[model samples]
Target: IDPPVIDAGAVPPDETGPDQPTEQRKICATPTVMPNSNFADRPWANDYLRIQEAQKFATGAGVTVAVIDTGVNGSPRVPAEPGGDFVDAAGNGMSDCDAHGTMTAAIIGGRPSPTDGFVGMAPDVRLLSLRQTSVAFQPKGARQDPNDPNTTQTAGSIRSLARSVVHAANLGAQVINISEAACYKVTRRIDETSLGAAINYAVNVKGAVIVVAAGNTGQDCSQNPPPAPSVPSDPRGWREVQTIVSPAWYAPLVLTVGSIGQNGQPSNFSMSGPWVGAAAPGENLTSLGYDGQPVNATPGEDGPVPLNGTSFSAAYVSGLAALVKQRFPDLTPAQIINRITATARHPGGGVDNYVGAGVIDPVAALTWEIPDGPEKAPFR
Candidate 1:
């Protein structure tokens, strides 16, 4: 019997839902193995953020971070413990067939090797791997289902994502990183109460910090057009229509991270929204492969493709959150979120729709001092 089809909710005609499966069913996420020659050099993001200096203060020891994505592979560098698998009941969340989750896990807490400069942001943090979604893997015996004319069913949905959040919180994950998102048209009305409740449970009930990607621009999600010459200084005026990326839209409760390039500028592919809380380097990135070796790309049907997206950016902030949590154990999740956003280097106009509080500053977030007063943290 085929697995039950996970409903993606009411996807209106105007809305483009989460990533759909291809017509030709693929077996699994099999990434092409690349040479590990570049593992000796430190990633640009690590150098740009001065991660080495920040580690001296706090190494995220004793903190457990959950990666809710395409399963994470266990390795000596990033030894991920099985959290649970929402996609496949037969498997634990310790395999990374899609090769995406392992990279995110490695970015958060992969151990450093004496031979290579490739190291994680918080190298000492514990990682709990939860497999929520994967495009590479399809449902078993999908073709035999008469209810479905087309084999459109995939491994995950918003429902599964919500369940994963609750599971992560119940498992005592201090920081939860969700690099996946579902996009919809602004004109559509969709029910997100389950996800909202899950986020609330994780934050208010469990005291866990939730981090999400701002989302990458694609068929389902579109980027805002550039401001016209008539409204040169008014970028806000250009927001005629927009795409809503969920989980990321759940701001304040979840810290949404945007993507920035090596030059410290916003990546053109990063979807913009008022919900974005922070920005991090996401372009031309390098991360640990499913096999635990340093890799810059994931295998594609055509060939190897470069790894870059807001997905990894969220991982960076998640790592920083772990560090901050370990250093200031008394601080609440809100306080840690505030410390990260408040210490970030704001852009030219301070806060805007894109990049939010600007690029995250790891060193400053670790050592910055704020007045100890009872106050609510700002949404910026």
Candidate 2:
């Protein structure tokens, strides 16, 4: 279709780092078409249509997607009653004061109730909220608690992040959405004794795929802006605390994600890593927000502030995972990772340095339009 297919893996980044987006994407179609009169609606990446289309085989009804964000608004699209919530590392479950986490939960699982506003990508999917962050910043001008690392999260700490995930797994959540997490370098190892590692243990052993944001630091990190951040700062929702280096993106069990536009190119600000799996629609999109409204918080602050980040991208893939799990219910978390990576479409000519294997195409993969390519040439 497009020239020498741009291997999303080759997308270029201005700087070098896990956060610098490298995929120099090529735009295809943007001419918004008038809503088709056909009853079978084939919507864009948003509008929850993705789930609807895949529901013929999977509705994620029997599965749960644990959300470790501010907490869900308990909307119809997002059934929270059948769900669970936990606090930060201490296991308290409160982080909802910012509404950012809540909005994230809603975007992935919100339902069709108009009274509550926009529904999520997988309305029928169950959700779990892990508050972990502080609500002291809700009053707008009210300053957040002094950047006390103790009061907030310990970026991907084996204790809290792992703890919450374990709890959800024990409760039977098939899929876990970690929209909020401190990115980490893959080189580092979590002390087997760390609570976070234990949490990951629960998920992996229990057969759950923990999908995490690759981080939202943009392609050119450091020189990007607002330096001096923290890792897994999700408990605080600050870029600093939530942003980890490249190590975190390497966890084998982790379904690392980067941001993409409706155009299907990686965002200049989306995170990237060698282990990254798939890219999805992440830029200039809309999703639930604090104050129970919808906003787009992507950098450059355009439009209604669609909830943009690896977090949102993770949710999208989570939905697809649910659909996949439905058909191959016996598949393990590792299996899910394999399918996506194994089925990913390498568009860019060469796998440059980032963008992982390539971008995700549920329709193509589901319908088998794009079959897996010949296996990697035998090392030769």
Question: What are the clash counts of all predictions, listed in order?
Answer: 0, 53
- Model 1's number of clashes is 0
Q: Estimate, for each residue in 55-168, the C-alpha lDDT of model 2 and write its tens digit.
A: 566556677777766555554444454233333223234235444566567656665544433446666777776643333321122225644332322332324454555566
Give the distance in Å from residue 241's predicted Cα in candidate 2 to where it truly belongs: 19
Full-model lDDT for every candidate = 0.78, 0.50
lDDT of 1 at 40: 81
Model 2 stretches astray by more than 4 angstroms: 1-44, 47-52, 82-95, 113-119, 134-158, 183-196, 218-247, 289-304, 349-353, 367-380
Residue range with the least summed lDDT across 10 consecutive positions in model 1: 1-10
lDDT of 1: 0.78
**TM-score of every model versus the real structure:** 0.84, 0.65
- 292-324 per-residue lDDT for model 1 (tens digits): 778788766686777789989999999999999
The lDDT of model 2 is 0.50
Cα lDDT for residue 75, candidate 1:
87
